[PDB]
Design an enzyme around this catalytic site. Structure first.
Site, short mmCIF file in Angstrom:
data_model
loop_
_atom_site.label_atom_id
_atom_site.label_comp_id
_atom_site.label_asym_id
_atom_site.label_seq_id
_atom_site.Cartn_x
_atom_site.Cartn_y
_atom_site.Cartn_z
N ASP A 165 44.16 55.33 22.80
CA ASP A 165 43.37 55.12 24.00
C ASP A 165 42.79 56.47 24.40
O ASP A 165 43.30 57.52 24.03
CB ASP A 165 44.18 54.43 25.09
CG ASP A 165 43.36 53.62 26.08
OD1 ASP A 165 42.12 53.79 26.10
OD2 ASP A 165 43.95 52.78 26.80
O1 LIG Z 1 36.50 52.79 27.44
C1 LIG Z 1 37.42 53.27 26.44
C2 LIG Z 1 38.86 52.94 26.80
N1 LIG Z 1 39.22 53.57 28.08
C3 LIG Z 1 40.61 53.35 28.50
C4 LIG Z 1 41.01 51.88 28.48
O2 LIG Z 1 42.41 51.81 28.69
C5 LIG Z 1 40.61 51.19 27.18
O3 LIG Z 1 40.87 49.79 27.28
C6 LIG Z 1 39.14 51.44 26.89
O4 LIG Z 1 38.79 50.85 25.64
#
Ligand SMILES: OC[C@H]1NC[C@H](O)[C@@H](O)[C@@H]1O
Ligand SMILES: OC[C@H]1NC[C@H](O)[C@@H](O)[C@@H]1O
Ligand SMILES: OC[C@H]1NC[C@H](O)[C@@H](O)[C@@H]1O
Ligand SMILES: [Mg+2]
Ligand SMILES: [Mg+2]
Ligand SMILES: [Mg+2]
Ligand SMILES: [Mg+2]
Lengths: 781, 206, 206
Positions: free
Chosen positions: B65
């Site tokens: 993430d």
């Molecule tokens: O936007 C990128 C990413 N940011 C953080 C989020 O937790 C995740 O779901 C997402 O894909």
């Protein structure tokens, strides 16, 4: 693209004169240090990683804690039980050296009492190129002399109190737009580099650099290099800016710290004149670069010695106490990570450092009020039958005085702008409050406060019954990381906020004795109402800090005759000022280019050049008494002819072409001592005039000395000296000052020195930039 | 925060759908921001190496993430294959050169990523990226070896096709009737219909 | 306020469309709240007796605007026929019996009202008033000579017929094209249509 030539090596300290004692002790300290310990002094610990807005690394082996660097120019930021002082623009409006000094002292006291080592101020950059520049109010004046003098006094006050002052921002940071790419991206701009302020050599010397020279000569311990570029080199890695202008020509002996995250070339920044990286990678790389000879040992030695010289110069060895507050919480205790598990430690001692500082704040408030108009409106008595108070700017911030973080709103009375240049109010006396106290302690007539700018029906209702209507209006601005009402730090227009102009017009249509108080960070366009016959008086009161209402009523009700003069011009239009703000990038994805094409012609210089008449000219202000000017006299002093500085520096001690050269260097013709070649401060003429109080009440006059340098490209006039003088009715005084060589010189890029041109010079003494009552030639010799 | 979850609860609850995802042939996994039993997901060897890559025998790649914290080069040893969004590239190179990270590991990272690529037929289906996340402008500047290039950044390629049909159908299929005492269905021949609540109306900002 | 209008202006501008109204066979006139040359319209004998009822020879009845000020019984003599919304009743009765209002005037007032009634065929088309102006309730109370009666007060008679058609049509015909530089008409196949302004949207209060 405008270009910044290289200048190496980075000059090492001389430690001559007023810096000798400090240098000697700095040397004895640094001599004892490992390379790692020296590097620690240059390295910030990380954003929000300790207690202060910035801290250096420590030297525990010698029981030396990291330095505490704390905002702001008008108080102690992020701290409780502190005072909120008037803004720098208010200090400028006093035209009062003594008050600037005493404000510095008091701020210094408060920082000292909290354990702060470096106060991050005062401000001479922005100087005030743009009337709509967001952070101008943190500084003093577009005029370099007014700013330079009061800058210097402020520094002496702070440092006399035992705290290191930090002249900022160096240099060319005249607007908030595009100051930092990440910030501009946050606003939907696609750029990868900060704007470049493109400033020619002549303009730099005669305008923006001038007050920084004063700062250096005043003994300031540190400088902060700015976020923006100057001629397409970031200030903090601009070798010409730091190594040449600051450390050679102005012979600055102290340390240069980066603005927070101000981009620089890492190890290359150190070679270009940077001494300290804030807020905090640089530590490790600096160590490695020394070990492999990319950075010579004398450079890092010099960085550490500058820092420690600043420390000893102000007596931090004597005045240092533990940092007794936390910037990031008001909680008394907090958890901290330990070698094992965690501790629960005291993080705020709630040490009350306010002392009696409310007095100087009230006083500076009163002294910074500028009477712009008075057709028999002021003073008031307090025995008026019915007093109407009008405008949100009279009333309370309904979220509490500190209810907007970093003051990032315009709720209620405006006493402080927004951003880093702030402090929390211990309390805030509003105009509504002070006016009601005044009435209810005196004649006890009627008084009503309508403090909703939309409540126009009520304002008519009340204004039509009033013996006097006191209308409050404001305009706010601040640092670029905060946007209020679509003002992205910089002001999007020169209008009164929240329909203030409508409030004025509504009240004035219903009351023929209307008084207007403006709390503005800078000028606003007043063309449509200032001349309204029903507006019997107008004051600017700026940003007065915690005692706003009280400081004001002392003036309005006649305990204090107003004596401030406006430290900037009130023009008819935005166009009057020239120098429009760049608000759209003009270099694709690269650094926008803010070309300073107007040269030295900002504020009053521009108005004078183009023959635009101001509504209220630079240096203008009224009194409750009258003054008369007579008998100007000019005495030539037959100073020694100017000698360009010459000779060599010492070899760089230990305790990109030329960047590792530690051999003796040639002194620049205009350098040779802190603040420049000492021959620049030789007194050339003594100029006198008589000021007489011809009125009926004691009052202060601010006589002003202007010079015409006489060339086709010179301003018609430039301010060169001033004083604030109390005179009893009938009393006279002889005002005597001197003009330095610098005062009557021009910068010559070819010879790289100040020159006195063959153009005939005229001296003027008067009560404003336009009211030049007296004049005489300056006879050459 | 650390989500503290016993081995049985993991297997019988939280891991179960992820097993289903592996088995459905999913090309990638994203490791979470939180910790599990006081080890960040993206550097949690039990989670990634044991549960995901051994027990569930996942063949695809693990991406972090965005800014999901890990122990840098040690994350790779713990089962992380791809770091998003970004400063570890040169550190992974070095770790391979000095032997702290085996060659077979970086190789396995690369081949997992490419295996996912070939599995869904990216080689056949890939076309240039024809939109920009950070602006709707058609053109924009990009830095070059020297000066700047003005480039196309959005082609405004309409990919909606007929997908309004399935979106409508799924909307209807996801309605749950919880109560009905003679209220529904309506006819459209009602004499007077009141519609109430902001949740019926438009977003006034678009 | 007194609207001060000269004879020529009245005739050539303001009175003109009212002459058309008379000639169209209009059954009633409403006299206005304002004065004309410093006599209230509803008691302005020059306006009602001369201009309207002599020169324009209006045959129908004049009714006051609601609470439009007039000289009571004197208004009847000045050409008012009906006082709305309603003391005038009994004063007028009195004035007839004691001779201040001639029998012929009241007779004329009544016959003007009834003439209008028969002219449009109210005798054929009149039905019970089946709605209430002051409530949407179906039932309500009315005072009886003893006690109260509960009565129907709204029947909710739908009279809209097909009138949405004419309303849509007049809507379209009342559109005035003031400028057109290649803007209109549209097709409905525009790639992106932006609609802007509160004047496009719903009254959130219904
Ligand atoms: O936007 C990128 C990413 N940011 C953080 C989020 O937790 C995740 O779901 C997402 O894909
Ligand atoms: O807050 C620290 C630092 N941030 C950025 C500002 O430009 C500067 O004036 C301030 O001292
Ligand atoms: O609603 C009754 C009546 N009120 C007064 C208005 O002027 C009139 O046009 C209306 O018919
Ligand atoms: Mg902390
Ligand atoms: Mg030197
Ligand atoms: Mg396997
Ligand atoms: Mg007739």
């Amino acid at each position: 693209l405008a270009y910044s030539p290289p200048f190496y090596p980075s000059p090492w300290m001389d430690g001559n004169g007023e810096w000798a004692e400090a240098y000697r002790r700095a040397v004895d300290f640094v001599s004892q240090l490992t390379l790692a310990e020296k590097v620690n002094l240059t390295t910030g610990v990380g954003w929000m990683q300790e207690k202060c807005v910035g801290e250096t690394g420590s030297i525990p082996r010698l029981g030396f804690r990291g330095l505490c660097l704390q905002d702001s120019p008008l108080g102690v930021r992020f701290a409780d039980y502190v005072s909120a002082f008037p803004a720098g623009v208010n200090v400028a409006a006093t035209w009062d050296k003594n008050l600037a000094y005493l404000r510095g002292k008091a701020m210094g006291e408060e920082h000292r009492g909290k354990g702060v080592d470096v106060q991050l101020g005062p401000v001479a950059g922005p100087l005030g190129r743009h009337p709509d520049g967001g952070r101008n109010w943190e500084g003093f004046s577009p005029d370099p002399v007014l700013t330079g003098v009061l800058m210097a006094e402020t520094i002496k006050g702070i440092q006399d109190a035992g705290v290191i002052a930090c002249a900022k921002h160096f240099i060319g940071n005249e607007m908030e737009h595009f100051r930092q790419a990440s910030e501009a991206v946050g606003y939907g701009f696609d750029i990868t580099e900060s704007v470049s302020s493109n400033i020619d050599d002549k303009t730099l010397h005669e305008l923006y650099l001038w007050p920084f020279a004063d700062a250096v000569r005043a003994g300031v311990g540190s400088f902060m290099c700015s976020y923006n570029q100057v001629n397409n080199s970031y200030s903090c890695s601009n070798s010409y800016l730091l190594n040449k202008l600051l450390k050679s020509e102005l012979d600055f002996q102290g340390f240069v710290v980066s603005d927070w995250g101000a981009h620089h070339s890492g190890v290359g920044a150190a070679l270009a004149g940077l001494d300290m990286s804030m807020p905090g990678f640089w530590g490790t790389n600096l160590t490695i670069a020394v070990l492999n000879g990319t950075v010579p040992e004398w450079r890092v030695d010099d960085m550490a010695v500058r820092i420690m010289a600043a420390f000893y110069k102000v007596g931090r060895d004597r005045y240092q106490v533990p940092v007794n507050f936390d910037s990031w919480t008001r909680d008394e205790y907090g958890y901290e990570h330990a070698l094992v598990g965690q501790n629960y430690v005291k993080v705020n001692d709630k040490v009350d450092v306010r002392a009696d500082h409310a007095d100087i704040i009230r006083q500076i408030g009163s002294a910074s009020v500028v009477l712009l108009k008075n057709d028999g409106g002021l003073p008031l008595t307090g025995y008026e039958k019915f007093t109407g108070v009008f405008g949100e700017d009279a009333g309370s911030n309904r979220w509490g005085a500190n209810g907007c973080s970093d003051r990032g709103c315009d709720n209620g009375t405006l006493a402080m702008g927004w951003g880093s240049g702030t402090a929390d109010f211990p309390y805030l006396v509003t105009p509504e409050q002070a006016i009601q106290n005044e009435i209810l302690s005196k004649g006890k007539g009627l008084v009503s406060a309508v403090t909703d700018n939309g409540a126009l029906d009520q304002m008519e209702q009340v204004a039509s019954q009033a013996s006097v209507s006191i209308v409050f209006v404001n305009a706010d601005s601040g640092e670029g990381y905060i946007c209020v009402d679509g003002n992205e730090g910089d002001r999007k227009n020169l209008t009164l906020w929240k329909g203030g102009e409508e409030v004025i017009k509504t009240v004035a249509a219903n009351c023929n004795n209307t008084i207007v108080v403006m709390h503005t960070v800078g000028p606003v366009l007043i063309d449509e109402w200032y001349d309204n016959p029903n507006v019997t008086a107008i004051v600017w009161a700026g940003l007065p800090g915690q005692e706003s209402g009280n400081s004001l009523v002392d003036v309005l009700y006649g305990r204090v005759s107003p004596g401030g003069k406006t430290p900037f011009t009130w023009g008819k239009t935005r166009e009057s000022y020239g120098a429009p703000l760049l608000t759209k990038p003009n270099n694709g994805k690269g650094a926008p280019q803010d070309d300073f094409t107007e040269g030295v012609f900002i504020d009053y210089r521009r108005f004078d050049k183009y023959n635009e008449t101001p509504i209220y000219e630079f240096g203008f202000g009224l009194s409750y008494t009258t003054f008369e000017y007579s008998d100007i006299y000019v005495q030539p002093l037959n100073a020694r002819p100017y000698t360009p500085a010459s000779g060599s520096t010492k070899a760089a001690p230990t305790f990109p072409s030329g960047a590792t050269d530690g051999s003796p260097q040639p002194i620049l013709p205009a350098g040779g001592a802190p603040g420049g070649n000492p021959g620049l401060y030789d007194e050339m003429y003594r100029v006198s005039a008589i000021i007489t109080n011809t009125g009926n009440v004691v009052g202060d006059e601010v006589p002003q000395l202007y010079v015409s340098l006489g060339g086709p490209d010179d301003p018609k006039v430039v301010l060169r000296n001033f004083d604030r003088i109390t005179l009893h009715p009938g009393q006279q005084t002889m005002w005597t000052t001197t003009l330095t060589r610098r005062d009557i010189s021009n910068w010559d890029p070819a010879s790289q020195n100040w020159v006195v041109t063959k153009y005939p010079k005229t001296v003027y003494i008067g009560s404003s930039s336009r009211k030049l009552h007296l004049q005489a030639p300056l006879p050459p010799y």
